[PDB]
Amino acid sequence: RKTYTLTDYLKNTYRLKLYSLRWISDHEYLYKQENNILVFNAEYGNSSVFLENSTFDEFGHSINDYSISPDGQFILLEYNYVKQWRHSYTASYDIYDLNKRQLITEERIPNNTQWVTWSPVGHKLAYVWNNDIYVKIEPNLPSYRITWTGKEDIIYNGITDWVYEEEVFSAYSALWWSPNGTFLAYAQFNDTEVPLIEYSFYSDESLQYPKTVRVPYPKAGAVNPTVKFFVVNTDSLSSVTNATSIQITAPASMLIGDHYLCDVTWATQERISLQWLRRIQNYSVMDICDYDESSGRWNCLVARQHIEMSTTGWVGRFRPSEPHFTLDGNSFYKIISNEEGYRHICYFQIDKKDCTFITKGTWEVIGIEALTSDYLYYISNEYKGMPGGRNLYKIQLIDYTKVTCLSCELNPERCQYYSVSFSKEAKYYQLRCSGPGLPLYTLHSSVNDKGLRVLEDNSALDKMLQNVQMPSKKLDFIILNETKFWYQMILPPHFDKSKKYPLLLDVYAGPCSQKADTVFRLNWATYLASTENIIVASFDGRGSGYQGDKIMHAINRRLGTFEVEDQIEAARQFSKMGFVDNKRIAIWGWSYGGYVTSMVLGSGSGVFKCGIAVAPVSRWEYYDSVYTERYMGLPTPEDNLDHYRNSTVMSRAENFKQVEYLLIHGTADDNVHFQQSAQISKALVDVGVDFQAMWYTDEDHGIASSTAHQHIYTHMSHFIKQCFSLP
Amino acid sequence: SRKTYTLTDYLKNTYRLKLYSLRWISDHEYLYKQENNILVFNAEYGNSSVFLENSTFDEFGHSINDYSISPDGQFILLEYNYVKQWRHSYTASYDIYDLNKRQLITEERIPNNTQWVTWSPVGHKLAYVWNNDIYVKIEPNLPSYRITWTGKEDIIYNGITDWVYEEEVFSAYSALWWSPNGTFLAYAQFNDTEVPLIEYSFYSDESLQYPKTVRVPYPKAGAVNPTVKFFVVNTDSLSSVTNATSIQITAPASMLIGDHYLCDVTWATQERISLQWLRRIQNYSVMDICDYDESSGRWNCLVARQHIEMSTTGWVGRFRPSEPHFTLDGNSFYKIISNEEGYRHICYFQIDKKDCTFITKGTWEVIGIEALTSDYLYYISNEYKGMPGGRNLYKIQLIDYTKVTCLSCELNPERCQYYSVSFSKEAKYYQLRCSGPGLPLYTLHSSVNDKGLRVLEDNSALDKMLQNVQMPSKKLDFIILNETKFWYQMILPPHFDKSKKYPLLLDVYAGPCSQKADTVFRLNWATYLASTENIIVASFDGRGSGYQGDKIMHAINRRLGTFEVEDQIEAARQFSKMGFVDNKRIAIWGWSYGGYVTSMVLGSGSGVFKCGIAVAPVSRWEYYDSVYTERYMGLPTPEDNLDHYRNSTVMSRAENFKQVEYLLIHGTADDNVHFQQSAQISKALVDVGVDFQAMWYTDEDHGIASSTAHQHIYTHMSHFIKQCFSLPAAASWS
């Protein structure tokens, strides 16, 4: 048989099939098959054509995406997609009347639109163009301008700035419609005093002079953006007068200093909840605000405030959790770390500070997935005590002891990692199994949790992989100080414990990272194992997530310490296993993992022959405020400046003499600025250490254009193969 | 068997070349720094006296970078806080020490961040540039007279050059020219208002949180150019109560019709200044000869004293029109000019007559006019043994052109085939500086009968050292192509056996008027590769190279990236045909223009070269500066030479790099050949899916010349060449 080759990985030869559906009610979903949109009845599996592919055969633009209005009356068509940062982009939009069969030609959505969204019910539109908000009541009618303060790189109304996009909301959107669309809530960010990161963009060969890209980006300790929050009533908008936006100000506990808006969740038609986080991210407050029908204002009663703090670290995994409100809005369920530091579901009454934990144990809840009148549905890693597995559970709102695992025993050898998609009122759910075996998508009914049918079993891919010498995956743990620390290994085919193999350590090791899991992947590690016979291992030490706060907070204010030492120790335990070749152990990572690779290579352990750092952080003062400060505090003498200075890659330059190093970075990286790698190379040069390097002209943090992606993986394969003496 | 010349020897300067750097102070005395002391030497008898004691340099606290004693010897200017800018420019702090009063001047001090400073040619007047304006000090202790008030960073330059004139026109930061006796101060003013800026990131020390963007007015080929104006101020009529009057000398109408440049300033007498102007299309230039008018206070450049210089086959001059050497009365001058056969020879002109008389001729060229007296003109040429790569001093009777004497040819013919000279203030004495093929030799001579006075430095110390080292040898010879000689040089390993097949590295420049094949003795990276690694390091001078006539030099006019590239490939073919070269192991490397030719050669698909290294290469001519590029390429317009600008890019050759091993190196703060150039090569390589090796150098400029980066690049490059040539490595403890 043949092996899974680099070409197979770079050309996507063996494709993973998915079953991406969009729910449209509590009994029907839409499914895009052969470019045509089908509407499926969930109970009987019968289909009808919703939108036939030929409809737009004369549109004249390639359509990137689509979005049907909740009432199914109109379809929004996305084209001219232009990527900005990780989540952002701009686009052109066209509106089609699905009943009249007419494209909207007057009062259109402008070109270079930043964000657009339908109301949760009906067909109102809200959009952001030139950093201002606009609302369309009817797709054929002129838009009402909501904001007038919009200014590129300065004022953002209803869109996020670089740092909130990346670190807080993981989205460009800063617009939140009320459940029935009466109100439109939005945030406004002000970057006036945020310093700019400047870098050269070379563009096409014809560009005579390079362009300087300038982005407001706050590095650790710098002046941060300010935020304001507003609510406009879209039902009282006028063609003759400018819109009235009511401001909801942050509480006094937050107003005394630098802070962030970290969550927006509507509770009812007249009740909105907001979470605010201090710049020192171990203290947060939730305001529960109500609309006053008689005054037009929004009252956040001090009696409905909920405080959340951490004595051992920061609040939340990456931010405070979102609340899941009951229909009356008088109570909510929220993931909170308990007295033992394990993240569990807490039940709050809006007027009561103390909550009741409805789950418990030495395992964590990952997310609350659906809340109904009788049950709360959640994902957790409780099953077989495996932190790297995922399963759906349901718990009875009137009896916490009434827990049922809905996914645990459906296909236990194939499916140990699930995600779920519930119908509009949770009558049905799609289970998405993603490992250890081939992905499996199934449809279920919540009536009595019974399987309806298999949506996608990846039989086509299984037929293909039967003729390929595929690698296997081992998931196990080592015991350190009477604590379990899990690892995974991508093992070559026909693996023999009596033979010795080179080993590559694939690192992330960031706070709340998890690199040891039950997910099935087709990646670079598949090629290295299948073709090159390299063991590709990953380890979750101190600072990794989903195992409790004693493990996750262990690196609080001390990045570049325990998580680094634990990767070295892991490799020691691996080498001192009879199938590893101690002379050929390598380490690699991208992003935070690039940082840990570099720290490991500069540690003087003598364990690693060689390593690759792709776009690494080198010093924490160069990275953004929101992420860095969460774990490190402020880079001031009064706070944590001493550890900011003690945890640089540069300080370890002399030790790189003991290793072969490949340093890679994209020149247009807006995230981990090229500066970071430019500072590593200069430190290496200053102590006279030889190393290998590669820059990627105009590539960002992803190094993801078709040609650069192919080049980096080809270049890296050569480096590893030469290090491991492979032909 | 003895030890070899190692990379460490090259990087740590283990074997040092001694020099004898002297400064003439009269027609019979020179100054020389020995044991940090300033010694004054009598040229005739070789006796010395101490001018300034080594210890005097320590009564200031700070370290002195350089010094400059005033012509009359009454004062000493002391340079400190030296901060490098471009190739020639820098800023610094200055202190003046009164040699008669034996005290440091502390009042009306030369300001910090001074751009340029110079004494008058006679006496002790000072002229300086601070914040892009000119200032004059009549007496070191007296307040300075502000000459200009228009100075503005990156916009108006008064008496200093902008980036492009410093690099390509004057090879200096200075744009100040004192009259022979210091009565007048002439200066240029450059205006960069509409010149676009090259912007690049500077990272600085690790403590800098946000990188800084460096912005420099830099005109790329075809872009808007700086404008120039020229002025003369009389320093003897300066007033404390009124602003100074600067008289403007305007360019002629033949230049004013379009874009142009000021390309030379040479004083003829106390009251006569000459200027040369060049059109943006550098095949036409005009010399104005301007006299001072006592009846007006102005400078009249009579139309009848103009001198036109043009070229039908290329550009004017080697890199610019030559400088004139005027006779004492200022009524005649001697100037290097290309003749009818295209060989550069000395022409004699009358200031009022258009036709000149060639005083030298032959299939060889004059390199420079070195001194002119009442009876003799002294010059350097490559006439001897018909060797373009050799250099010798000659003298000629101004009264009989056939009466030529070689003053250096036969002093030490096996050791000395490459000379430079330094004449005393009225040419009574001269220092000869021999720089190859043997060890450098410095000797003192008297011009009265060309009598050899004494040996100043024979490098005996270094000879003693190199006797215990297995040194490589140097072969200088030629190949015949189309009945034309093309010279080459080869750094050959010690105990060189012609019966073996050695690997070969081709060390390239190949720029217009380049000369890489010569008789100079060098201690460099090529010495290590030959001595230790047993690699032959060859260099070839093909079409476009200088000092052999215009048929060779102009052959690449409007066609850079053609003949000079093909000729390097052909050279290597002839080298692999020589029998002692291993055809499977031929590499090519080069910096700057040589980086460009390396890249073009590697992308040619010839199959001759296994591997190559391009250090800071030009990749496309539109990315390089106007003055250099346009000289050979014309304008990048459809009407002019855009088609060849597009046809001569490295990027267009990306697919062919599949056949070779490539190392691309570039400094991130290179203000000259912008990192952009290499960033465009790597993107082209990536787009066609070609693998290659790369290395950037954080905050390093075009020289990659800081102690640590210099050591790193040469170490990294040695490893690349050794792996390409299958040569073994050596482990080290740490």
Ligand SMILES: *[C@@H]1O[C@H](CO)[C@@H](O[C@@H]2O[C@H](CO)[C@@H](O[C@H]3O[C@H](CO[C@H]4O[C@H](CO)[C@@H](O)[C@H](O)[C@@H]4O)[C@@H](O)[C@H](O[C@H]4O[C@H](CO)[C@@H](O)[C@H](O)[C@@H]4O)[C@@H]3O)[C@H](O)[C@H]2NC(C)=O)[C@H](O)[C@H]1NC(C)=O
């Ligand atoms: C998957 O298959 C399902 C079952 O076949 C589909 O559901 C069926 O949909 C149709 C149309 O939406 C419904 O048809 C008519 O229902 C009543 C009569 O109901 C009785 O007969 C049905 C069979 O004809 C049975 O299935 C029922 O159980 C029941 O015994 C009629 O009175 C309706 O008429 C009204 O609407 C029509 C328009 O279609 C007008 O023309 C009439 O004048 C009148 O106003 C419907 O015609 C049927 O009820 C429904 N059955 C069930 C059990 O759901 C389902 O739509 C399909 N899903 C997809 C996505 O394809």
Ligand SMILES: NC[C@]1(c2cccc(Cl)c2)CC[C@H](N2CCCCC2=O)CC1
């Ligand atoms: N910018 C943060 C981060 C990163 C990238 C590059 C370098 C470094 Cl040091 C960090 C890590 C956390 C990520 N994140 C944030 C929201 C919750 C889910 C999640 O996974 C995003 C990418």
Ligand SMILES: NC[C@]1(c2cccc(Cl)c2)CC[C@H](N2CCCCC2=O)CC1
């Ligand atoms: N910028 C011009 C040049 C160069 C550097 C790098 C790349 C390229 Cl393409 C060209 C070549 C000519 C040199 N020069 C100019 C003054 C006269 C004497 C001389 O030797 C200087 C450096």
Ligand SMILES: *[C@@H]1O[C@H](CO)[C@@H](O)[C@H](O)[C@H]1NC(C)=O
């Ligand atoms: C978008 O741009 C195109 C091309 O310039 C133009 O024809 C079109 O009308 C624009 N669309 C809108 C909604 O303005």
Ligand SMILES: *[C@@H]1O[C@H](CO)[C@@H](O)[C@H](O)[C@H]1NC(C)=O
């Ligand atoms: C933005 O903040 C600046 C100060 O950083 C302030 O002057 C300005 O008024 C603010 N703008 C808005 C729209 O709030």
Ligand SMILES: *[C@@H]1O[C@H](CO)[C@@H](O)[C@H](O)[C@H]1NC(C)=O
């Ligand atoms: C709305 O606000 C803008 C900006 O302040 C102003 O130009 C416009 O005239 C206002 N319109 C009305 C009706 O107030």
Ligand SMILES: *[C@@H]1O[C@H](CO)[C@@H](O)[C@H](O)[C@H]1NC(C)=O
């Ligand atoms: C939406 O909610 C608002 C506020 O409670 C209410 O006034 C309105 O009637 C609701 N609309 C619908 C369609 O129920």
Ligand SMILES: *[C@@H]1O[C@H](CO)[C@@H](O)[C@H](O)[C@H]1NC(C)=O
């Ligand atoms: C939050 O962190 C700061 C900085 O370490 C500290 O002063 C404060 O005590 C912390 N809060 C809690 C409740 O631990």
Ligand SMILES: *[C@@H]1O[C@H](CO)[C@@H](O)[C@H](O)[C@H]1NC(C)=O
């Ligand atoms: C284990 O305990 C020892 C002793 O306290 C300590 O040095 C080490 O860092 C601890 N952590 C792990 C995970 O080994």
Ligand SMILES: *[C@@H]1O[C@H](CO)[C@@H](O)[C@H](O)[C@H]1NC(C)=O
């Ligand atoms: C050299 O010696 C002569 C005496 O013959 C003397 O007059 C002269 O000044 C001396 N010069 C120096 C610089 O020592």
Ligand SMILES: *[C@@H]1O[C@H](CO)[C@@H](O)[C@H](O)[C@H]1NC(C)=O
């Ligand atoms: C130059 O700088 C030094 C150090 O800052 C200062 O003491 C001195 O006064 C300056 N000199 C002048 C002439 O301004």
Ligand SMILES: *[C@@H]1O[C@H](CO)[C@@H](O)[C@H](O)[C@H]1NC(C)=O
């Ligand atoms: C510089 O040139 C600009 C035109 O490009 C002109 O407006 C300006 O006055 C000039 N300045 C001087 C001092 O020549």
Ligand SMILES: *[C@@H]1O[C@H](CO)[C@@H](O)[C@H](O)[C@H]1NC(C)=O
């Ligand atoms: C000299 O020129 C400057 C700038 O134009 C002016 O400020 C100053 O008053 C002038 N000096 C005299 C003495 O006229």
Ligand SMILES: *[C@@H]1O[C@H](CO)[C@@H](O)[C@H](O)[C@H]1NC(C)=O
């Ligand atoms: C210097 O030259 C000027 C101009 O010809 C003249 O006026 C002056 O007297 C000369 N001085 C000396 C010392 O020769």
Ligand SMILES: *[C@@H]1O[C@H](CO)[C@@H](O)[C@H](O)[C@H]1NC(C)=O
């Ligand atoms: C100068 O160069 C241009 C462009 O090659 C040419 O057409 C012109 O005839 C030349 N001019 C002179 C003065 O020889």
